[PDB]
Amino acid sequence: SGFRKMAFPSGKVEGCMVQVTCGTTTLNGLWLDDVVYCPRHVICTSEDMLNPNYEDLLIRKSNHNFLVQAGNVQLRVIGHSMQNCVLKLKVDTANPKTPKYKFVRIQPGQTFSVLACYNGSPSGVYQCAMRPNFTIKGSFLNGSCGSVGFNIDYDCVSFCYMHHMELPTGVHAGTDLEGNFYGPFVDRQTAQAAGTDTTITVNVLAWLYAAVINGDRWFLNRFTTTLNDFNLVAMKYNYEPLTQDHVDILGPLSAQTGIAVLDMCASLKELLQNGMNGRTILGSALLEDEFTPFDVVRQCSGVTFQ
């Protein structure tokens, strides 16, 4: 019992964090096998940040310009290439702590753990979600660039995010491990703004099923709704539309609790109308949207608390 915002154990990722210095810029790199991945803006000179020509800046660099530090050992860079917004530094030593890994690009609503690093050293781990506006609400100070997001499902690390920038609202933008940004963002200091964010509806529903599995039923009601009527209400509270994919994904939780998805949808509509009235759901006075249906099944038991 109990429901917490839980991150994956970060050990497999800690053994990959290195410091990458290029001139006056220092940030984090991900050392996997004989390659160090990091944001390509490590080659920028702050002035360059507005309209950098990364191909032009990279061509002027030599291997010895990149100082890579793994603990108290300096790695030797023997090659460098750029793939989208990520810089790939070939090093002369394979990381002996390289775990089984994959590079996965995630969709909005997906959650992952972030290992926040400064100077190649891990300082904290937290759980986050890719917002529908493609930003993450992280906790990142200057020097955190190159910090990664990941999931650890069954001994394999799926790297899904690398931190690159903070937008003016305090939210964060980054890329997958192939250098493609999530969202309409660019690694330039040009005026950029996060679009209006919305609540991840399928995740809220998954968290309402977690609350039911944990013995909380106060918010349930005798009503059902159509998928279209639910979406018409949801859009008015800046909630993402719920698709038939989402309804299908919620199927296992619906079967385990005995509450049809559209029944839980009607309970959500009522919560949006009434608020909580001084009550909490899983220790929260707001509807939580950073737990996917997969996270709820993973964390919760296979026996509901009737």
Ligand X SMILES: Cn1ccc(CNC[C@@]2(C(=O)Nc3cncc4ccccc34)CCOc3ccc(Cl)cc32)n1
Among 12, 80, 131, 164, binds ligand X (CB under 6 A): 164
The tally of CA atoms less than 13 A away on the side-chain side of residue 35 is 11
DSSP 48: T
Residue 142 makes contact with ligand X by CB under 6 A: yes
Among 45, 74, 81, 123, binds a second copy (CB under 8 A): 123
Q: Which does 188 bind (CB under 5 to 8 A by kind): ligand X, a second copy, none?
A: ligand X
Phi-psi map region of 2: left, alpha, beta (phi>0 left; psi -120 to 50 alpha): left
Rounded CA gap, 146 and 206, in Å? Answer: 31
Tell me the C-alpha to C-alpha distance, in Å, between residue 284 and each of 4, 7, 108, 266. 11, 18, 23, 20
For a second copy, what does the binding mask look like between residues 141 and 170, x meaning CB under 8 A? x-xx---------------------x---x
Query: Closer CB to ligand X, residue 46 or residue 169?
Result: 46
Tell me the C-alpha to C-alpha distance, in Å, between residue 22 and each of 67, 162, 258. 6, 18, 57
Among 63, 127, 189, 304, binds ligand X (CB under 6 A): 189
Query: Closer CB to ligand X, residue 238 or residue 301?
Result: 301
Residue showing tokens 């920038």:
165
- Which tokens belong to 85? 């917004």
Query: Closer CB to ligand X, residue 46 or residue 228?
Result: 46
Residue 73 makes contact with a second copy by CB under 8 A: no
Please give the residues from 239 up to 268 whose contact with a second copy meets the rule CB under 8 A. none
Cβ 117 to ligand X shortest distance, Å? 12
Scanning 80-88, 98-106, 258-266, 284-292 for contacts with a second copy by CB under 8 A, the matching segment is 284-292
Cβ 265 to a second copy shortest distance, Å? 22
Among 95, 110, 135, 144, binds ligand X (CB under 6 A): 144
Q: Which does 7 bind (CB under 5 to 8 A by kind): ligand X, a second copy, none?
A: a second copy
Rounded CA gap, 136 and 106, in Å? Answer: 12
The H-or-E segment that residue 13 falls in is helix 11-14
Scanning 65-73, 136-144, 152-160, 213-221 for contacts with ligand X by CB under 6 A, the matching segment is 136-144
What spatial distance separates the first Cα and last Cα of the chain, rounded to whole Å? Answer: 13
Residue 187 makes contact with ligand X by CB under 6 A: yes
Q: Taking a C-beta distance cutoff of 8 angstroms, is the pair 20, 146 a contact?
A: yes
Q: Taking a C-beta distance cutoff of 8 angstroms, is the pair 263, 227 a contact?
A: no
Query: Closer CB to ligand X, residue 144 or residue 199?
Result: 144
Residues belonging to the active site: 41, 145
Rounded CA gap, 207 and 195, in Å? Answer: 25
C-beta neighbour count of 274 within 10 angstroms: 9
Binding site for a second copy (CB under 8 A): 1-12, 14-15, 115-119, 121-126, 128, 137-141, 143-144, 166, 170-172, 214-215, 280, 283-286, 298-305
